[PDB]
Design a protein around this ligand. Structure first.
Ligand code: DCM
Ligand code: DCM
Ligand code: DCM
Ligand code: DCM
Ligand code: DCM
Ligand code: DCM
Ligand code: DU
Ligand code: DU
Ligand code: DU
Ligand code: DU
Ligand code: DU
Ligand code: DU
Ligand code: ZN
Ligand code: ZN
Ligand code: ZN
Ligand code: ZN
Ligand code: ZN
Ligand code: ZN
Lengths: 136, 136, 136, 135, 136, 136
């Protein structure tokens, strides 16, 4: 059903859209895949129309205004006319615990990720809520 | 662009769905309205299939697993086949700064609320991102 | 799998929207619920942009132009991008024979009602056409 | 709208009216929006109803029968596309009860061919801001 | 279900929409039918806004710019917000091999046809790709 | 006008999905983009459920049964519940005149390409039918 070739293609598509991020700390990308369709592609950045597109606060920390690639993928799916329920998620980085909570409640059956985010606990949050997790 | 009777009807519906929450600390409800349609009703609580519906810990603080009413309304809209963009939101309590971030990115033009959340900074966040706010 | 707590909330929402009616004889409200979503909310009244709000003529009777709550919810569903088929209907009052007829042809599986309308034949029409009926 | 498609939509209405099992009169209604026939309704008894007949022993129409416009309207609620800003092709001009709902549904125009016994329904349409054309 | 009476009606509708064609060689109509709805109706003709209405050149052959009734039906379904998957296709003439290829890949379960087109290979192609074919 | 880096991201996504193709002569990919969403991704190949996925005959030429990347993108949009009308197309190669015919009728307002396909007349067909063409 989901061959190693297409599964690689979706993950590489995630890596492409992470490069669109203006982020200095980490460039993150998220892809929502359902029935051979990419319904959303999210990357980390400040809100639409924000006074700056810089993700960092001058103290070295990420601005609390910036949205995570997963949040942007969820928000897009809410603005979309297609359901996120039953879809799969291709992330460049494992989602944070706050995001993993929403991803599970959204009805995403499986999360694919390539790299580990500094907070690993999101993986456990996903599996504890009945979401499959595969590192590739 | 809304008759006061209709405005009150939506707020009372938010208050009606907040009461189904199992939360002890505060019971919160949220209603997504677009073109005379309640596209989503969300209340605060633990995720679906979670081991319990109790929202607080042994020490009496809220469980980090519980989703907010606004989060649940946001997630429901991602499961929905209708767009949250251009809609209005009716909340029993003013959204937190974290939710307000997603609400503004979702394209919600106005947020109606009745009671104030401890962290009142969310109202400021919403207004700073071009979302009208009204207490009623 | 409707639970009593949540089922009462839908009926009380129907009662909330019935109060929006300008009708003097009887205030009626109808709620379309499918998959934990309120797809339509209808109440009795004159058509949109009619010369008057008043539902009754200067004689005792109801203006033949006014739409029943069930009619308004039905029409609303025709304007909706969601299907009424498989949904449940929460009504403050039992639907009239003319409405009951359309409700069954719409594919509504169950109608909930609280009060009995003067003509109680609609209950039979519903049950004869294979629509479950519960009073609450 | 080009005259030739206008006639094609009306002939479609006339084609679906014939599927009716009605003895008194066979009526067909077509919902058209952006080159698409979203609903095609005809007069008949409800689904699952014990009979196909559309009339009683007096030979009056059975109150259980749905009008062609009603079936078209109901189908639009069962579907996932909006009737709002659509046009309606009818073999016979809609009755006042159906015209009420047609107008509220946001149908902008009604095309009709024959006149139904009660002519008052056309007047209802125009009062509620719905364009009417006989063809 | 697809009874003889209604099946005839769908075929005659395809015959009605073929007469709209400005073609002189042959007038062809195709309609897409799913769950009692005619989602598309296509006839053969030049593209929208093409310099001429004439479907044939000066040599006697059809202009290569002319879209087949099946193509236009397919193209319409792409502009539509409804899915062609699982639908049935009523055609005045049996589709050509080129169209039959796309029709099968679209997920059309059955194609009905009345008259046979010059190149009858379309029928074979259609069956070889798992699409039912019935002449009426 | 869309940002240059996302424009490159779409083109590279077309290049990613062209690699999934099992074709030896040339690997082609097509991407449908509307309002920051990839509604379709198509590549050249044999139909679904075909005996093989080799797209060439012993004659070293291409099997007439194979679908072009743009055909697969078009068909996918018909199977979809979203509209192709007003979208932009990202292609690894310039479409053939047969596909360009359908692309213009679908309402695609712009075609982006990287490489030139041997028959260069497809660009002419697109431009003659009011479709913007840009090489990148
Ligand atoms: N296709 C898109 C478009 C936007 N965004 C997110 C990333 C930034 O957080 C914000 C940027 O908004 P914009 O590009 O409209 O200025 O929106 C996204 O994830 N995917
Ligand atoms: N219409 C609904 C249904 C559910 N929930 C939320 C409330 C709980 O936090 C979580 C669990 O609900 P359930 O018991 O239906 O699985 O889903 C919601 O916000 N709105
Ligand atoms: N959300 C709505 C809006 C309107 N109506 C119906 C009730 C009256 O019959 C009429 C009122 O029209 P308007 O809202 O334009 O004043 O429409 C309804 O049932 N539900
Ligand atoms: N495409 C359809 C199918 C059915 N009906 C209506 C006409 C009759 O009132 C009833 C017939 O019952 P059934 O759907 O079982 O054929 O349904 C309709 O208007 N349009
Ligand atoms: N409902 C429609 C509308 C249009 N067309 C096709 C017929 C012509 O080939 C092309 C051009 O039509 P027009 O000149 O009206 O834009 O559109 C079609 O098949 N079905
Ligand atoms: N997302 C997809 C899925 C399939 N195909 C096309 C490529 C081949 O021509 C055929 C392969 O089908 P499948 O992989 O289901 O066997 O369908 C495509 O272009 N894009
Ligand atoms: O789930 C996540 C977690 C982090 N990110 C992004 C957001 C931040 O700009 C970068 C930097 O991570 P930080 O939280 O600053 O360590 O990570 C994300 O996009 N999605
Ligand atoms: O914006 C908000 C903030 C809190 N809630 C719910 C979440 C918690 O269960 C109760 C109380 O939160 P607390 O942060 O514990 O005060 O509020 C909410 O639903 N929406
Ligand atoms: O099925 C029904 C029956 C009555 N109503 C409403 C419409 C009228 O304004 C009130 C008054 O009842 P009546 O007795 O029909 O005049 O009832 C309704 O909304 N739906
Ligand atoms: O507006 C109308 C009027 C009548 N019909 C059908 C209803 C009946 O079956 C036939 C005969 O109408 P009658 O009301 O019996 O004259 O017309 C209809 O479908 N739409
Ligand atoms: O599958 C098909 C095959 C032919 N046609 C139509 C299109 C052309 O205008 C006519 C003439 O075809 P010809 O090949 O010239 O016989 O056939 C079609 O619409 N769909
Ligand atoms: O416009 C085109 C032309 C060819 N392709 C595919 C078709 C074939 O599989 C390869 C090779 O083309 P050919 O026509 O075989 O040279 O290109 C395509 O997808 N789109
Ligand atoms: Zn996160
Ligand atoms: Zn919150
Ligand atoms: Zn009624
Ligand atoms: Zn009628
Ligand atoms: Zn053809
Ligand atoms: Zn091609």
């Amino acid at each position: 059903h989901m061959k190693p070739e297409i599964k690689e293609a979706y993950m590489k598509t995630a890596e492409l859209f992470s490069q669109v991020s203006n982020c200095k700390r980490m460039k993150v990308g998220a892809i929502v895949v359902k029935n051979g369709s990419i319904l959303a592609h999210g990357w980390n950045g400040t809100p639409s129309g924000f006074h700056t597109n810089c993700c960092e606060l001058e103290d070295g920390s990420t601005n609390p205004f910036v949205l995570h690639a997963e949040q942007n993928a969820l928000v897009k799916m809410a603005k979309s006319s297609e359901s996120i329920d039953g879809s799969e998620l291709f992330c460049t980085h494992s989602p944070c615990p706050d995001c993993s909570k929403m991803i599970a409640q959204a009805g995403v059956k499986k999360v694919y990720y390539r790299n580990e985010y500094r907070i690993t606990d999101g993986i456990d949050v996903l599996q504890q809520l009945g979401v499959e997790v595969e590192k590739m």
